[PDB]
Amino acid sequence: RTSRNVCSNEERKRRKYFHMLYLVCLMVHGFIRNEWINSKRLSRKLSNLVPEKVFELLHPQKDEELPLRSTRKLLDGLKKCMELWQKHWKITKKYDNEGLYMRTWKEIEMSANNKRKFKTLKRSDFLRAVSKGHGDPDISVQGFVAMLRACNVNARLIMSCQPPDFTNMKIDTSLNAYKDMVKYPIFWCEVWDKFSKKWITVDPVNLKTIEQVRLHSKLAPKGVACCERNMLRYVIAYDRKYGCRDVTRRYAQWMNSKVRKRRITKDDFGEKWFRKVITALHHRKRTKIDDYEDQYFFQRDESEGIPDSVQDLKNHPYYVLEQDIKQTQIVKPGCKECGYLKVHGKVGKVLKVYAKRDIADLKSARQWYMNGRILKTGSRCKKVIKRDERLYSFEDTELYIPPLASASGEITKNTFGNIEVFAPTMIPGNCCLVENPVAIKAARFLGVEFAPAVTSFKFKPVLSGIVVAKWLREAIETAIDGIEFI
Template structure:
């Protein structure tokens, strides 16, 4: 025991002494049972059990069992555990001695009865983190930039077509092209009125167009395939050099009958006008796709201007005054004449990358510019309309305004006939043939595409849509059956109130923003459901009339005038800057007019503009306002004059102080450092 510290030796002696006392020791049931089994055997088993017990006890106190260990009475089935020392024995030791024990140098030997314990932990393999998909979509800034580029391209190309249309009216070009038109062909293009049957006159006119087309095909030779085509967004970073085409070169190409495909189509329009046939230059604009939201990845090759075009960008239209029809003529690509009923051969498929028929503009000889895309797009309302910038109301206003600005001729009868044709073609287009095309369709709607504030009334289907691959059909409704619903407050802000006893057509949950706005409106209703009503469930709100100039006000001392019909009978609304002050000076009854609300985040602030007063004060009130205005102007003039006088007084004071200092201390040269 030489290696055991002194303090531990004393502990062991005391433990052995108490083990021989009369007091029963604490036992371990499992250990006692094993010792009983050892005592039932021979002496060797007893010795082995004694040695095992000694090893256990030695290991418990951190010493080797082979060294001088106190004897243990195993025959009495008693074991000694060092941990179970009597509390009274603790008083014989000094706490300071325990604090100085070097436990790091004590290295007990493992007992032969102690075995290694292996714990198997089934570690669940960590799932690899899912990498967030990088959306290949442009950001908001890039989206606005593309919209600007798209809009500028449309404007530039429409001006380009306008200029080329003016060039087609050149008289010098017409004189050379008239040589190509024989007398008989000219007579075919202008049927005699002596022909009674309109069909015969139209047939003769079409024969004249066919002969004129053949003549132009023989005369004009396409020497270059260069021309306009549809660019993609990643083409704008590439520098594409183009040779400008001045009017002299344009004129020379048509007169000589040699040039590009675009000039060839424009030359045929000049030939029609040389023959005095009402005609149009038709231009299919090719802006980059505004619905393409993908990030730039690659650029087309520099050889893209030399691509072989399969569909035209320019072509012609001729007007038949007998059948009131515009006939389409393509003199370069397809060399055809067609009267479009449903689908045109000039419309490229949606997958064709270099030509998309989304914007078709027609320019006539008189300067009228018109969008005629509806004539050539087979699925205009289902597909083409979604590819145009005009799907947004604000952009549609800009687009229509720009076309009207280019037009120099008012609407005539031919334009009215064409408008009727477009309306009939829209009806003939019919329902879309897939679910996606029903989204925001102007004439047809599916019930699943309705907004949260819309219902169908009356709910009568106009057809069925069969889903491919499934044995089911979906009812289709007309867009005219869609009714917009609003809350009672929203209808009140439009000058209408609910009829008594009408049930809501729809109930939806209020949003947190709506609950917050209710508090801004002074509504303490905590109902989380919002009841919506249709317009036919409301009636016009009639405010109480103004009697003897007295205006009935609300709880806030104001009057709601969201629409003109909410002005009380016998009263007027005056919305001038000094109307409120004038009413106060006259000491008449008035009510500030709440014309709307200003919404800021989740709050609503009333917007007060003007006052409501009795009709008998409508003549005197403007006079008082002019007087108040003159007084305000005079007050501002006096304030400005006082400010100027104070500035002069300050400057004079500074000059007097400067003079006094110079007189007392001498003049200071300001140029010296």
């Protein structure tokens, strides 16, 4: 089941967790650093570095004739700022060690035996460093963003987080050149263009260039050596109003087939977990800007296209290989292959690839009930899988409507005395579901009319609460609140 040179199962889990723990911290760090960048004392000082002519270019007038010529002045302004900033940044220090680039599991484990001393760095030291123009490449960019914000340009702080690689199962990750690590930045800038409605990518420090990313970004690491400590997986963007969005999509060219499997977000719990973290750091409400960007991301997910390998089409978010189409699924009518994949080699075969959006999930009559649906009177299955079960599709089903509770709050129950609620739709019209490990006790204590609620199974029935008339909700709520006395 597993390769003989792979780490234990506990270690595989410890790495996922450590990866997560490390990730949050880095994202929290970028959040706080984003606040420091908005320092009032800092802005008033950096505002003095931008000539009045350049300030204008950064705020062009709507060119009726061709919007393209105003975006051009914006880019001309940024290029200007990029130049004067290189003059302002007198001293450029190297990273004491590896900066915020990715560390190996071996390095992280040895960080206790190879103790390091750290120079405490506070908010006030960051402000001093930026105003004097002294510091490593990370601090230099962060200051650059501060300057643009001082000129009132919607400029984001971009941070490519590098926690250790949890998909690395090797019991020993070792290495290894400084010039390779720093070929691509961890931090950079993004300026908003009102005229073209696109975020412009700016790197005034490392690659020292400005680019309007469409499909290819010069900032994404390339080459075995450069990706050693820089595996682009989570590119986070922080703005003036304390917003926090995951912008990897713009920088990862093979987001859905390569990057995805490296993210903790490749499964479901990781997708949920990660969404809580970004939420906890997003301190503002959606905006039109967030819609223009979401649109752009949409078009990038359409453009990525079908990958060129079998492993990449495995558990991909938008495509499936004909062989991986489950026995409980079928191709929707009027839909065919989305494309093909030729397995290279002499005895190489061609595989058909389908969009998941054209695959339909079929379910037995019981399975549909678990979704609160029943088969319509005139319905014939779409397939029959043997063990025999008949499977139907969503169109062959109708919404299940449970009887209403009586005036005394009585609920129609099954032979065993329970009511089944697998979807909010299965809750009687005049009732409600009270989910609490104590709800049944509180209800039995009150000796009121109710029904134990089975909401799932064990492989038997799992009671998670009760279903009660809506007018009995308060009484049971009271009892639950004070079960200490029951």
